[PDB]
């Protein structure tokens, strides 16, 4: 995390908690975008004078660029940089994790990127701490909604329908 550590008690506004091998984070409902680590909002689709400072993506806003004539661009929030057209923590610029993603280490006072892996993998000290070693992760999510439990979906833990339910879970 770049801010406070996300926990099982964190409320994701217009979002929901997900778990990987080394952290929790908020994922947005439908097509919303993160304006911070705990808040999702609608995004604008074009950056100009009318949409300045509006969210244009995960951890990005339309920012006034002080160029030859003034222009506007979707620019990552403080602490983030564009890598493959998505905003990731600056200290993750050069970090490659494979079956996972880079996060800031909330246990380190020096800002440092570490790999947090898909459910199934763990940091491999033999392989530059990338997500190449197979390993188990205990799910921390409570999943108190109707007929819901922590399930692994596409490499991440999320609360989902129990055995025999689809769409609230019926």
């Amino acid at each position: 995390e770049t801010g406070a550590k996300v926990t099982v008690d964190t409320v994701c506004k217009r979002g929901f908690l997900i778990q990987m091998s080394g952290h929790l984070e908020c994922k947005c409902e439908n097509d919303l975008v993160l304006v911070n680590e705990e808040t999702c909002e609608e995004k604008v689709l074009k950056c100009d004078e009318k949409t300045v400072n509006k969210p244009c993506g995960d951890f990005s806003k339309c920012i006034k660029i002080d160029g030859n004539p003034v222009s506007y661009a979707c620019k990552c929030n403080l602490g983030y940089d564009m890598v493959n057209n998505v905003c990731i923590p600056n200290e993750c610029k050069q970090v490659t994790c494979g079956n996972g993603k880079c996060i800031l280490d909330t246990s380190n006072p020096v800002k440092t990127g570490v790999c947090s892996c898909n459910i199934g993998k763990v940091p491999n000290v033999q392989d530059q701490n990338k997500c190449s070693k197979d390993g188990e992760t205990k799910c921390s999510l409570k999943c108190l909604k109707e007929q819901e439990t922590c399930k692994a979906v596409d490499g991440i833990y999320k609360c989902d329908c129990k055995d025999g339910f689809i769409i609230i879970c019926t």
Partner: antibody
Amino acid sequence: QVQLQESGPGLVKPSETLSLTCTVSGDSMSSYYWSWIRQPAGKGLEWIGRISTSGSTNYNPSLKSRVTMSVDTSNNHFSMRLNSVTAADTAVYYCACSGSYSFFDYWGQGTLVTVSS
Amino acid sequence: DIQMTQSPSSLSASVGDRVTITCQASQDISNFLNWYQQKPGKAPKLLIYDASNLETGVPSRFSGSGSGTDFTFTISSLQPEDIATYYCQQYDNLRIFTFGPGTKVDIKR
């Protein structure tokens, strides 16, 4: 910046499906939310629904069961279909768009649709 | 129907007059309220967005203020080309666009 131009059938028979097309020139369609808005003669404006090229849809709940919309970026077309039309659907139909999700700063000229036998 | 109000429903003013129009949204919408000008036979034209921001190229005599539910639109000095119906337009938490009933401004000459 984009320029919008509606085209429609003029007449549509009652209970049949109204099909409209908005031809777009200028910026990429992916940079805008695309909406249809209609206005009966001497009446106010009714927003019908909003979509984006990403596949997101945001139809007015009053018309969701009758209306669908789509974008064809290959031919720069933004379309809507309104099922089971009646005389209450006679109106000027506008296409409109914006990079913002909460207003409309680009408008077509409107096309008048008359439901009639 | 979701209820919005605009006052007055119509008005007749002289060139140079100060014109003030009010709009009340159906709920607290913060600043998600926009003002459009629809001249006869033409599409609506956005003049004010986000309650108080002037659209690029719109004359400085147009302005808007307000937040929450109660909003005003002001033409500081009415000009002949300003005759039109003016609509406020809200965007609520259900992502629904609703236009107000509109205010028609005519000119006394």
